[PDB]
Design an enzyme around this catalytic site. Structure first.
Site, PDB file in Angstrom:
ATOM      1  N   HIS A 148      33.844  23.083  51.905  1.00  0.00           N
ATOM      2  CA  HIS A 148      33.074  23.184  50.665  1.00  0.00           C
ATOM      3  C   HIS A 148      31.657  23.718  50.854  1.00  0.00           C
ATOM      4  O   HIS A 148      31.130  24.353  49.951  1.00  0.00           O
ATOM      5  CB  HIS A 148      32.943  21.768  50.059  1.00  0.00           C
ATOM      6  CG  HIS A 148      32.219  21.839  48.750  1.00  0.00           C
ATOM      7  ND1 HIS A 148      32.688  22.506  47.647  1.00  0.00           N
ATOM      8  CD2 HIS A 148      30.981  21.391  48.432  1.00  0.00           C
ATOM      9  CE1 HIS A 148      31.739  22.527  46.723  1.00  0.00           C
ATOM     10  NE2 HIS A 148      30.737  21.816  47.156  1.00  0.00           N
ATOM     11  N   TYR A 152      27.312  17.217  35.594  1.00  0.00           N
ATOM     12  CA  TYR A 152      28.701  16.822  35.388  1.00  0.00           C
ATOM     13  C   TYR A 152      28.997  16.205  34.029  1.00  0.00           C
ATOM     14  O   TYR A 152      30.159  15.889  33.739  1.00  0.00           O
ATOM     15  CB  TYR A 152      29.090  15.789  36.415  1.00  0.00           C
ATOM     16  CG  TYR A 152      29.267  16.283  37.833  1.00  0.00           C
ATOM     17  CD1 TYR A 152      30.516  16.714  38.249  1.00  0.00           C
ATOM     18  CD2 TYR A 152      28.235  16.264  38.762  1.00  0.00           C
ATOM     19  CE1 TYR A 152      30.742  17.071  39.567  1.00  0.00           C
ATOM     20  CE2 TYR A 152      28.434  16.710  40.065  1.00  0.00           C
ATOM     21  CZ  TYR A 152      29.705  17.075  40.485  1.00  0.00           C
ATOM     22  OH  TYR A 152      29.865  17.416  41.809  1.00  0.00           O
ATOM     23  N   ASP A 189      29.299  26.658  44.016  1.00  0.00           N
ATOM     24  CA  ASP A 189      29.539  25.332  43.444  1.00  0.00           C
ATOM     25  C   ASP A 189      29.034  25.374  41.997  1.00  0.00           C
ATOM     26  O   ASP A 189      29.406  26.251  41.264  1.00  0.00           O
ATOM     27  CB  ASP A 189      28.987  24.232  44.321  1.00  0.00           C
ATOM     28  CG  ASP A 189      29.369  22.841  43.860  1.00  0.00           C
ATOM     29  OD1 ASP A 189      30.537  22.454  44.059  1.00  0.00           O
ATOM     30  OD2 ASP A 189      28.505  22.153  43.238  1.00  0.00           O
ATOM     31  N   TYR A 232      36.572  11.744  41.275  1.00  0.00           N
ATOM     32  CA  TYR A 232      35.160  11.490  41.491  1.00  0.00           C
ATOM     33  C   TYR A 232      34.366  11.893  40.243  1.00  0.00           C
ATOM     34  O   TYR A 232      33.285  11.384  40.017  1.00  0.00           O
ATOM     35  CB  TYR A 232      34.673  12.220  42.752  1.00  0.00           C
ATOM     36  CG  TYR A 232      34.633  13.734  42.581  1.00  0.00           C
ATOM     37  CD1 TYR A 232      35.778  14.499  42.714  1.00  0.00           C
ATOM     38  CD2 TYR A 232      33.451  14.365  42.214  1.00  0.00           C
ATOM     39  CE1 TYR A 232      35.763  15.864  42.486  1.00  0.00           C
ATOM     40  CE2 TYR A 232      33.403  15.735  42.045  1.00  0.00           C
ATOM     41  CZ  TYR A 232      34.569  16.459  42.133  1.00  0.00           C
ATOM     42  OH  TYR A 232      34.570  17.784  41.861  1.00  0.00           O
TER      43      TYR A 232
END
Length: 320
Positions: free
Chosen positions: A297, A239, A108, A156
């Site tokens: 995931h 992010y 990730d 998202y």
């Protein structure tokens, strides 16, 4: 299931990479150093099934709390979580431990970090492995807000941009948060589409979600306890650096990654889809691959036996 880890029974290490930034890790095993880097919003403990297996296979495992998480520092500033800063910290981390190189394995966002480490600091990366996350050459002619927007499953990521908003939702009920997130693909209670319009990630999902087959209540409560320390700002800040990360990646000037590399795809990861790894061999001449069927995931806890087999086979042939 493979052997797992009891937090209390681990060696806990701490390295101050800068006066305000100390990174925590757990360490097990002797042999070549392997540095495991988790994703969002996870923990060193996401590697609980790999840590014993990799140690037993003859490796010295260092499983990080990434910056923002757990016992590691979590400064509030957004730009403290750009790839450039995070990678330079991980170099300093190696320096302070006296390690010339390590193998870096990530999943990730930790997968993104390990790619950048291999790209810009190959001399410190003995070999690199990524679960789910591809390496993508930066396109020096297009902006990050053209790519995100096109992909509807990435909506998202827009909900996560404005500081405080996703934090409030994710922190409201930590048990509900982890129980809602940590699910197999077929058990998913979440949509990644139209999150902004819906009003949040959990507006339509159960108030008292059931426990995934993948996790126990005790395991959920470990994550809950860890996220009481600093909450979700640091984690979400990963992010919030898209433009900065893109500009840094553009400085690579088309250089390849020439060290040993492994890309492992997960059939049922609907965000980080296998196809996103399609042309990686063109940038990475010594790339090897793995693929896990029936795997969503949360690769390490969905299919731990498979992960352990793939990583140990590759480590023994290419990393050692």
């Amino acid at each position: 299931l493979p052997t797992s880890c009891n937090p209390s029974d681990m060696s806990h290490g701490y390295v101050t990479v800068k006066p305000r930034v100390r990174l925590h890790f757990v360490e097990l095993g002797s042999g070549p150093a392997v540095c495991l880097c988790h994703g969002f919003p996870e923990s060193w403990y996401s590697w609980r099934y790999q840590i014993p297996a990799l140690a037993q296979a003859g490796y010295r495992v260092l499983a990080m709390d990434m910056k923002g998480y757990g016992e590691s520092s979590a400064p509030p500033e957004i730009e403290e979580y750009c790839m450039e800063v995070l990678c330079k910290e991980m170099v300093t981390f190696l320096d302070k431990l006296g390690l010339s190189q390590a193998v870096f394995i990530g999943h990730d966002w930790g997968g993104m970090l390990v790619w950048y480490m291999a790209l810009f600091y190959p001399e410190r990366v003995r070999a690199v492995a990524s679960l789910n996350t591809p390496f993508i050459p930066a396109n020096p002619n297009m902006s990050p807000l053209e790519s995100i927007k096109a992909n509807p499953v990435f909506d998202y990521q827009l909900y996560f941009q404005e500081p405080g908003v996703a934090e409030a939702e994710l922190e409201q009920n930590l048990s509900r948060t982890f129980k809602s997130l940590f699910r197999a693909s077929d058990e998913s209670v979440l949509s990644m589409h139209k999150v902004c319009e819906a009003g949040g990630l959990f507006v339509n999902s159960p108030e008292e979600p059931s426990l995934s087959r993948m996790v126990t209540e005790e395991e959920i409560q470990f994550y809950v306890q860890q996220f009481k320390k600093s909450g979700f700002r640091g984690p979400l800040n990963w992010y919030r650096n898209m433009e900065r990360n893109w500009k840094w990646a553009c400085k690579s000037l088309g250089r390849k990654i020439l060290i040993p590399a492994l890309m492992v795809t997960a059939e049922k990861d609907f965000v980080l889809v296998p196809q996103m790894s399609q042309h990686m061999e063109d940038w990475i001449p010594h790339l090897k691959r793995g693929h896990i069927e029936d795997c969503g995931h949360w690769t390490q806890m969905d299919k731990p036996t498979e992960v352990n087999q793939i990583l140990i086979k590759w480590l023994d042939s290419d990393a050692r």
